[model samples]
Target: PLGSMSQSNRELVVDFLSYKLSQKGYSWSQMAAVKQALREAGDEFELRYRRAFSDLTSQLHITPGTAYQSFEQVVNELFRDGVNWGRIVAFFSFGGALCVESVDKEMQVLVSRIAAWMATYLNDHLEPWIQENGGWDTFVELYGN
Candidate 1:
């Protein structure tokens, strides 16, 4: 590593960045596709998520769930009847475009809330018959959403 490399060494910098991106699932084809979509759509996260889900579902051989956009419905399913959180399919997202600061905060809030809910659910059910075979499969079989 030199003190400060000149612009003539730009090719090395580009190669380094390309290598680093690949370490996190970003490669030539994926980056190019993202860049093209960004250029046209002004970096829409929804578009990216939809496209990602398309790719993921194709690979996983499973279809996406039907639209249940209401928050009340989610709460009822997770807590009302028997209070099995695993039966809940929650989708938490921000209301508008998320800038740099809000992106981390919003995602953190959603993830923390979901994790806390799951932890509470496991704690509540550990004493029940679920203790014998307690995992995702057991949860699903007993409480089908």
Candidate 2:
């Protein structure tokens, strides 16, 4: 079931998984090839899942003080079952939703902080699993057409 993904969706998965790597100044020869692909995938994920993602944002009640705690708790629950492409996309969706919520609540400063927190979580927690699963290259092949 996890193997079924469109080319653009697969690229979205790649982008989300590799975001931390980008922060560390790592570059891949393949990155140029997929840059546009990733952008399209991001847009598609947002549009396709907006309703469900918005519902989650509505319930979060993430104030400045509770933001980090809320993110950590919800993300931990997301991966409690195990990681998969769908769950990974949901993680990105969650981050995007958090940024939107933050801005809407007039806490625009939290947006960058939320992104940083996401990168930290990905680096500290998800990186090991991602490496074990063959990282972004493997994801591209598995989910791409």
Candidate 3:
């Protein structure tokens, strides 16, 4: 809010998300949905979506490198065709790191991009699984607190 994000950090975020999605074998068509979702989300979606990142990052001090490195390691562990809780948390954690470290134009774009992707993922993937599993409360209990 007070300053700007570095061009390099901006690039890092872009690359991080690219690699993150690529590792999961998502196609560009899938990515197109993410873009559409972001465009549709506008401001209200950001307010609701950003809360998870703020909540987690405020509680933990994570560096860009630590975020990237752990993202590299953990995404592999969490990669799956279907939604699972670990992958959901990992994506948000990376976004939290992006929020704290990168504050430039590209970072802003990335903020919107990841938010779009996560929102799309939740609607198409996690939401149904949660419903089938019982409900939001049970899903949270099974996944985490």
Candidate 4:
């Protein structure tokens, strides 16, 4: 589990959630925090992932009871094009935003399912890669550890 979830990764998860919370027009001041986090993540990263998420949202029609299928399709498409940890992180961030905009009950369910998928993807695909490379520990400084 050397490449499994780590502190920095957990921070990224929170950052991604904040992005969604801000996108949903939340009342708290997490918006600024979210923007700062996104900036830290990089402008080009935002541009690419946001657009991809938008396209996925449009494709799925944001319909109820479709979170799993939509997530599967989105992840598969991204994977097919070859993946890196950053791209994988972007996917979760994008999905986080999508979940926030979903309808009440749908939002809960979809976000839950989507969160689960993100974890699975990280463990199955990303973990091994990180171990083979330099492990998640090496990302600490890059993520501002």
lDDT string, candidate 3, 1-145, tens digits: 3224545877788767766764564425544444433333333334554674553334433343354454445444555666654445555555555564444323444444445545665677567776786654453345321
- Residues 20-135, model 2: lDDT tens digits: 55545444656532443344455566777765555656766888899999899999999998887667767877898888888888998888889888889889988898899987
lDDT value, residue 96 of candidate 4:
59
Cα TM-score per model: 0.24, 0.66, 0.37, 0.54
> lDDT winner among the candidates?
2
Q: In model 2, where do residues sit more than 4 Å from their true spots?
A: 1-29, 32-55
Better of 1 and 3 by lDDT: 3
Reference-based lDDT, residue 68, model 4: 66
- Candidate 3 weakest lDDT stretch, 10 residues: 36-45
lDDT of 4 by residue, 1-145 (tens): 1224556977888768876865664424434543444445644565675576654344445655666677778777877867665775566666655665564435555565566777787788777876786554444334421
When summed lDDT is taken over every stretch of 10 residues in candidate 1, the lowest stretch is 59-68
Residue 107 in model 2: lDDT: 91
Q: Which ten residues in a row have the lowest lDDT in candidate 2?
A: 32-41
lDDT by residue (1-145, candidate 1, tens digit) is 1223544578778867866765454536644443333333322434665576642112221111211232234444545555332222221122122222223344323333344444454466433634555643443344322
In candidate 3, which residue ranges exceed 4 Å CA deviation? 1-77, 104-106, 142-145
* Comparison by lDDT, 2 against 3, better one: 2
Best by TM-score: 2
Q: Rate the local accuracy (lDDT) of all candidates.
A: 0.38, 0.72, 0.49, 0.60
